[PDB]
Structure formats: structure tokens, C-alpha cells
Amino acid sequence: DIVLTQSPTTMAASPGEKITITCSASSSISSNYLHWYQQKPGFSPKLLIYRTSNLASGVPARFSGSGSGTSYSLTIGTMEAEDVATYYCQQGSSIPLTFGAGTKLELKRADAAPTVSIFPPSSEQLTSGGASVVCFLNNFYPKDINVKWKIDGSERQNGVLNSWTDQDSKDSTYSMSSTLTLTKDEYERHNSYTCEATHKTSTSPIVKSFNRNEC
């Protein structure tokens, strides 16, 4: 069965920059049956390139493709913001049909620090018997970021769950959500709750806190 190995896994490109991504097959495959799809976040994949090098309908001329044998590539002549997407290669000369795992293209832009906000458990939730503490880390670049929770000034790792947005279409930044969940009883055995974000845009962490007995 053909394995298609795409690289790189993820790639960041400056506007105007020439971009080349590669698809490598486990055995020689026929080039008339090698195609590329583009998938924008929240949309279906769409045929982008067929038969190694033929641009599909609607596809701007800055795209192209080439290769033969075990080795194929897709090139974008000048990166545009509208090109932010995951690209998949696919072979159809052997059953079972198979796909590469995709290369995600992202746009470079100026560094931007996260705006950070912490939120205590609502009374509604405590009544139910639980306590979630939420920290938002919004609109930062680049995407690498680290969040540390502390309770009463000690690091806390269990009960934390993180979620990340896709790169934002309007400003090219990323955003993150971090939720620390406790039982009401445990939440009521401590006073101070803190989230700290470490990001390259500052030499000390951003720290946001609250106290269970505040006014």
C-alpha cells in the first residue's frame, strides 16, 4: 500500500515569499494519478492540482506542482494571506487510495503579546458542586506559548485542559484558552489562584490572579 509522507508538517511564510512543499511516496507511483487538495479551516477540502501539475478550476496562477516517481512538490510563487490552509497530496494509481497527512501553511507577522484574563467559578457552577477557573490568552504571535497554573503560589498540573484557535483570518494571530477544574470542596480549601503565560514577547511572564475571599 502506498504511504505518502508530506513535509514539512507545518510551515510559516512571510507575505510575498516563495514556498515549496513536498510529497514523498513509499514506492514509485504514476504521475497522472497524483493530485493535491487545499483545505481552508471550517471548509471542505477542494481539488487544487490534478495530475501532478495541472491547476484546477479557480486556482490562481501563483500555484504550480511537479514531480514523478516517488517525489512530488507543490509551489506557491508568492505567499498570500488567502493561502493559509492545509494542503494534502493523494495517490490514485494503487488500491487502497491513500492521502498524505497534510502540510499546514501559516502566515508570518509581527510578534504580539497575549492579552491575558482570569475568571473565577460562577455561583451557578458552585451550586452544582464544581469549580472551573478559566484563563484566556488572546491574540498573540508567534503560536508557541506556555501556561502555568498555581494555587496558593504552588504549581498545579492536574485538572488543566487547554484549547487553541486556528490562526486568525483578520490579523494572523493565535489565541488560547486554559481551564483548571476542581471540585467545590477542593476549591474551597485554598484561596489564591493564578495563571502565568510565558511567551517570547516578554522577559517576565504575564501573571493574572484572584482570591477566593475578594471584594
Partner: protein
């Protein structure tokens, strides 16, 4: 406007059965190989089944014996009959039109299948307001934490759709057979609490819709 519209996807138990439909329009359906693909939660694409113009079917070993693709060249409809389902069959299913060189040139919007023993559960919707002691300046950020629902999806709007800029609604995370997501909105500091902020959370599968106004935290 060639178009493919998938329907029938939803929640089913492991071992269950489910039939997906794909309604084709704007081209001559009887002249094309038609195909089901699926995209896993990990965003991996997988071939599920093909069917020739003449009804010859093909499958990878993963679903062979379990899924049956069929077609009705007269109503212009493609089917996928699923049975013996597993959690790993959980995915978004795409109806795709095949070409003679084994590319897919037309794709539907997709229909979502969740194979799980978890029960349908409405979300609890909690407000996220800044602590009573929080300090000011310029922009405020508020939120809704939408917790303990099943299955996907929910949809959140702010102010029945009025507020849309400055929103980040985060992908859901699953733990012990339940989903949680949060959504944040950022609005001008003077604009709140003056300008009412409410999140609206709809949960189709539960016939649930709720609204939560974000009230300032107070002594």
C-alpha cells in the same frame, strides 16, 4: 453549480447502524464514479468506498464487510449504509465525485458521525465575569463557559449575533465522555455593563438553547 449535499450523520452506539445519503445536482450523476471519504478528528483523510457508474463497489479493509456504498441513478442519490460501527468510525463523512484519473473534483459540505456510548446531554452554561477586584483599562474581556454537553456540536453567538468582532470561540475538548468549550468576547470598557452582553448557546442534539447575561461580580 454542481452540488453534493450529505445528510444523515449523527450519534450512534458502538455496534449500531446508520445510513448516510448524498444528493447530487447540476451534472449527469449516472456518468460518474462516486465516492465516500471521511476526515478523522485528527484531520486525517481516508478513502471509505467507491462505486462505479455500473454499481461495482470497492472498499479498504478497514470497513470491508461493515459498510455498503450504493447508488440510485434515478433520484441522483448516493448512499453509505454503516453497520458494526466502532469509535474509530467517528468522523466527518464527505460525498465526492471521482474523475477518470482518480481525483475528486467536487466535494460536499460533509456530515458528521459520532460513534459513542455517552448519552445526549445538554450543556450547563456559566458566565465568565472579571473578579470583583479586577482592575480597569480600555477593553474588557468577558466569557461563557459551556460545559458538560454531548455530542458535538454547539453554536455560540453573542447578542443574538450583534457582537461578532472580538470573539474567540475555542474548539471543544472532550473528557470522560463530555465536551467543554469556552467563548470569549472583548468590548470597550465603558460599553459594559451599560451595553448588555449575553451569550446564546444552542445545542441541536438536546433541543436545548440557552442565554446567559454576563453580570458584574459584586459584594
Amino acid at each position: 453549480e454542481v452540488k453534493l449535499v450529505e445528510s444523515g450523520g449523527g450519534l450512534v452506539k458502538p455496534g449500531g447502524s446508520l445510513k448516510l445519503s448524498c444528493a447530487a445536482s447540476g451534472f449527469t450523476f449516472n456518468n460518474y464514479v462516486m465516492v465516500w471519504l471521511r476526515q478523522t478528528p485528527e484531520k486525517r483523510l481516508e478513502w471509505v468506498a467507491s462505486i462505479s457508474r455500473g454499481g461495482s463497489t470497492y472498499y479498504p479493509d478497514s470497513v470491508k464487510g461493515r459498510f455498503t456504498i450504493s447508488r440510485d441513478n434515478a433520484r441522483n442519490i448516493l448512499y453509505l449504509q454503516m453497520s458494526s460501527l466502532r469509535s474509530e468510525d467517528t468522523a466527518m463523512y464527505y460525498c465526492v465525485r471521482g474523475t477518470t484519473i482518480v481525483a475528486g473534483d467536487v466535494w460536499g459540505a460533509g456530515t458528521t458521525v459520532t460513534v459513542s456510548s455517552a448519552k445526549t446531554t445538554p450543556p450547563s452554561v456559566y458566565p465568565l465575569a472579571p473578579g470583583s477586584a479586577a482592575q480597569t483599562n480600555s477593553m474588557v474581556t468577558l466569557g461563557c463557559l459551556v460545559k458538560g454537553y454531548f455530542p458535538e456540536p454547539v453554536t455560540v453567538t453573542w447578542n443574538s449575533g450583534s457582537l461578532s468582532s472580538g470573539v474567540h470561540t475555542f474548539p471543544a475538548v472532550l473528557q470522560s465522555d463530555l465536551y467543554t468549550l469556552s467563548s470569549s468576547v472583548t468590548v470597550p470598557s465603558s460599553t459594559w455593563p451599560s451595553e448588555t452582553v449575553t451569550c446564546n448557546v444552542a445545542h441541536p442534539a438536546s433541543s436545548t438553547k440557552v442565554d446567559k447575561k454576563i453580570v458584574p461580580r459584586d459584594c
